[PDB]
């Protein structure tokens, strides 16, 4: 082959040395437009702001807007001292797209994005996040100002439906995949950053937005995504539940979902981290309580199932990050409460409805029984002890007997039949159980004399 060798070089070299750092130009570019009746970058956005408000119905893919959205998207104690110096330079840049009209375009474009998932919309979020990121209130104020102004409806009308498709792990595809959510993960962070720094004026806006003649409720919808995510993850459990050892792609694809799940709870928190009690009242009537139930079922079992060997722990560390935050919303779904408050009593309800699920998670926390045990029978210069000797050791120093077999399996079964103690202390895991213990006290302290809780 001759010419074919030419073209292959055209490909691989493009895959190779073309993909590099010259693309870091953009600050030089954005500053160029920031120079000196508006400066050009302001001119630039004002154009797309025009373009987005054109009545295209089906908003056009736009290879120019797509580019400048990314351009602007990448425009963004001593460690603290330069942190503010970074945060200022961040704030100086975040304001650069803010004093200029870009704050408005993002939100506008999305209104034109409507039902579309069409790539360009993904790039807008990348700008709509980068403008925020730090929670920059000034934008966040203006970004609100735009909406009660226009009362355009089509903003949320875009987002609502946008989440209704959005993406899910959906198992049926997986088997087929065996032989997109990054955009979902992105968007909820977008919604999060609309509520970063607790804008009760704005947080309520998501609850109902009174100015719009329509009243979309993002929250109940953003929960529906979670409940929608729930079905997959729960179904994703049972599929590997018989397979014990997990596929790397399954180990990977699951993590991809957890990245999405981790984000969504954060949004639920930002809709509630502010003590905006009416938002959580909405959420209290939500099927989110059912949503809470199921993750625990995941957590009841996926967690212990991950708890078998070192290869799983990476993902197991991921799931613990998930459960960590999951109570953080559930804790924050409480933070402002009367003693026998209704919102609390409902989480009094879930723990009993999820009885066995919440039981199993706790037994994982017995782990010190994660350390002291071998001292009673250790012998052989490496921290080793035989699994049977470790079993005989556990008869006394008393963890429940059915669980005792699990510790061997949860160990390592290293070197034929012997077990290190120090390796067998990883589970890190403590943060959840802190938060659980917080939560379970937080319940007993807010709601007492409810014996099933006690």
């Amino acid at each position: 082959p001759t010419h074919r060798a030419c073209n292959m070089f055209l490909e691989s070299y493009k895959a190779a040395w073309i993909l590099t750092e010259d693309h870091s130009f953009e600050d030089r570019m954005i500053d160029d437009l920031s120079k000196a009746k508006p400066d050009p970058l302001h001119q630039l956005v004002l154009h797309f702001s025009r373009t987005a408000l054109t009545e295209k119905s089906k908003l056009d893919e736009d290879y120019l807007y797509m580019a400048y959205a990314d351009i602007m998207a990448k425009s963004c104690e001593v460690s603290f001292e330069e942190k503010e110096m970074e945060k200022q330079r961040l704030l100086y840049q975040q304001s650069r797209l803010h004093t200029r009209g870009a704050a408005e375009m993002v939100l506008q474009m999305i209104s034109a994005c409507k039902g579309e998932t069409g790539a360009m919309v993904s790039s807008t979020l990348k700008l709509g996040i980068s403008i925020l990121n730090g929670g920059n209130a000034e934008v966040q104020q203006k970004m609100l100002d735009y909406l009660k102004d226009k009362k355009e409806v089509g903003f949320f009308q875009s987002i609502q439906a946008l989440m209704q498709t959005c993406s899910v792990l959906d198992l049926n595809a997986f088997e087929r995949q065996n032989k997109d959510d990054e955009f979902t993960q992105d968007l909820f962070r977008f919604l999060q950053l609309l509520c970063e720094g607790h804008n009760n004026d704005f947080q309520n806006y998501l609850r109902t937005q009174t100015g719009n003649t329509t009243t979309i409720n993002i929250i109940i919808c953003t929960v529906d995504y979670l409940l929608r995510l729930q079905e997959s993850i729960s179904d994703f459990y049972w599929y590997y539940s018989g397979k014990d050892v997990i596929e790397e792609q399954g180990k990977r694809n699951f993590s991809k979902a957890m990245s999405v799940a981790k984000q969504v709870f954060n949004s639920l928190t930002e809709y509630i981290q502010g003590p905006c009690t009416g938002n959580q009242q909405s959420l209290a009537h939500s099927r989110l309580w059912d949503a809470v139930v199921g993750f625990l079922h995941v957590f009841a079992h996926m967690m212990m199932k991950l708890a078998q060997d070192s290869s799983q722990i990476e993902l197991l560390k991921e799931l613990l990050d998930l459960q960590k935050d999951m109570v953080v919303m559930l804790l924050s779904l409480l933070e402002g409460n009367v003693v026998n408050g209704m919102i609390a009593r409902q989480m009094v309800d879930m723990l009993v409805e999820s009885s066995s699920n919440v039981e199993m998670i706790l037994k994982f926390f017995d782990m010190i029984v994660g350390s002291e045990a071998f001292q009673d029978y250790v012998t052989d210069p490496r921290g080793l002890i035989s699994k049977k000797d470790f079993q005989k050791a556990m008869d006394s120093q008393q963890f429940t007997g059915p669980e005792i077999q699990f510790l061997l399996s949860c160990s390592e079964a290293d070197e034929n039949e012997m077990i290190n103690f120090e390796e067998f202390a990883n589970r890190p895991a403590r943060d959840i159980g802190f938060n659980v213990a917080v939560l379970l006290t937080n319940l007993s302290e807010h709601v007492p004399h409810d014996p099933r809780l006690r």
Binding site: L171, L227, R228, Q230, E231, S234, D235, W238, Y239, S241, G242, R287, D290, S355, S356
Partner: protein, 258 residues
Amino acid sequence: QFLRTDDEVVLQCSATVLKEQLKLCLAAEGFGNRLCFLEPTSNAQNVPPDLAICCFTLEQSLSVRALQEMLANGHRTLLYGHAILLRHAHSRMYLSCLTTSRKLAFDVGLQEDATGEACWWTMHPASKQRSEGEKVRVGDDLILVSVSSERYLHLSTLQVDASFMQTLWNMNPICSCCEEGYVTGGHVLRLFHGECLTISAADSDDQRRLVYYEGGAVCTHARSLWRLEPLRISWSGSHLRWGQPLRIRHVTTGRYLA
């Protein structure tokens, strides 16, 4: 208010056969005839339904894939996606899609075990409103589909059988559970005189229609038994209360006292 695990329930269905608006129980004695058959309910008055048999206790409500895992081996609310086991209240043999023609589609009928794919039945709602993950509303449209053959639970022209054609089954619960020591409706019990209520032994010239109090003998015997039937197809299982209508089916006769 939502359908749940261990809820006594029956498949009410619906039909407008001829002109009669014929809703009906799906039931079989099980014993003596495992094949299921109709127990019509549109005439819940002059010709009362055999409520004793149609009752079907719920057992478990595993997810589809979850159910597939249980094959490889807690009053939970039902959800529109789980398959469900369906215990017969009487024979206790669980409901299934048995293989028999009656057209080309399998007859409904009981197993003798929790085991096997036949036992289970996915619930797909038809309505656009209803969807997966929703707590299953009482009386909403639902379509059972046997996991064993994935035929819909069809009401063939009348006899029930699984078939690829749908039928809009509806399912009103009898009752959740019971508080101990208190009488639910649909229950079978003796009525003690403080000694007990009874009838005559079989092959009496009476045709066993004469009614008696009696002590001894019968008090252990089956003829002493009496099934209460509060007069509703739906929440018949509600805790019994005086001052509400309730025909008293006798047990051994199957006759109503009158």
